[PDB]
Amino acid sequence: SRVAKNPVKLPAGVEIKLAGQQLSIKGAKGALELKVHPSVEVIQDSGELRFAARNGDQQTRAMAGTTRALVNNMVVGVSQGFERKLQLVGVGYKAQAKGQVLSLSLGFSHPVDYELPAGIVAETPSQTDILIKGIDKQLVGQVAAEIRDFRPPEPYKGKGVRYADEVVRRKEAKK
Amino acid sequence: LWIARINAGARQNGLSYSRLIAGLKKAAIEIDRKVLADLAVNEKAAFTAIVEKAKASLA
């Protein structure tokens, strides 16, 4: 476990509270992080966050690295909000963000209304670019993947909503 | 039927059937299962005295 031997190095403006196996982080631009730990993994409290196991088990060793990743994600989220960038390709493919509803026109017979849950907020700097900001990776990624499912990229022209950092396999018609 | 009754009565005194027979045979007692089953039901005070004799035989 190389990752479990690396501390987190929480920045200057953060706050921690360990109620036994219960953990939370306070931060600016977002707070109220919640998580409950399996009883086989330990989080010491000091000026630095460190993790260690309790058993010599294989599964326990695997969980000692997952929790280090999860704690790292919450610390960043309450300081630098995560985001994902979506890109729309195709004629007539435009989207307008209206508060908590994102209106998408993807070549169907009716624009679709996507509801953004609490936390994440979306805004479109253009009509062919989306931005889903948030303070937790799991919710930002899941909602970005839900939007992407409406019209996944085509292999012949790239048409459809895609990730802004995605490689798309392109091929040509044999005809 | 007798074995099923000595088993139920021996566990009231804190011992299984198979451990009671080993203790009885090890020390001295040669009473039948027909009489042991009868003492278990009627004469529960004598049965306890017999069981404490089998327990005291370290078996």
Binding site: - | A4, A8, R11, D38
Partner: protein, 142 residues
């Protein structure tokens, strides 16, 4: 000097209450079946009902080990062609929590008129309370 036999008229029946709140289904059920039959009494005879009364309170909190929570399957046939019907452990707890404990114990009892009489002394509920405070059951472990 004949062997003592239990008369169905002068038997003593006590009431016990058991909490199924973290107990394995099959290891809780074997202790219930012993008490229901009377095997724990020196007066046991095979042809009379000489057991005790058992009350189970937290039926829905019984558990199974391994992957049996999903893969354990209950079948029954309705009598019409193609009438085999099935349900698993997760669904049955949601539907009828009591039918889980009742089914386990019922298969550990004899299949005859006396076996069905042993089965009528088992009361299974899903709350933390039972309606038998008059009979004053006493707590039984396992």
């Amino acid at each position: 000097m004949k062997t003592y036999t239990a008369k169905p008229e002068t038997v003593q029946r006590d009431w016990f209450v058991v909490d199924a709140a973290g107990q394995t289904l099959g290891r809780l059920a074997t202790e219930i079946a012993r008490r229901l039959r009377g095997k724990h009494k020196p007066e046991y005879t095979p042809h009379v009902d000489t057991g005790d009364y058992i009350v189970v309170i937290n039926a829905e909190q019984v558990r199974v080990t391994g992957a049996k929570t999903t893969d354990k399957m209950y079948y029954h046939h309705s009598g019409f062609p193609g009438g085999i019907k099935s349900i698993n452990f997760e669904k049955l707890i949601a539907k009828a929590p009591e039918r889980v404990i009742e089914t386990a114990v019922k298969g550990m009892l004899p299949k005859n008129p006396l076996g069905r009489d042993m089965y009528r002394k088992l009361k299974v509920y899903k709350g933390a309370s039972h309606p038998h405070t008059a009979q004053q059951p006493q707590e039984l472990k396992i």
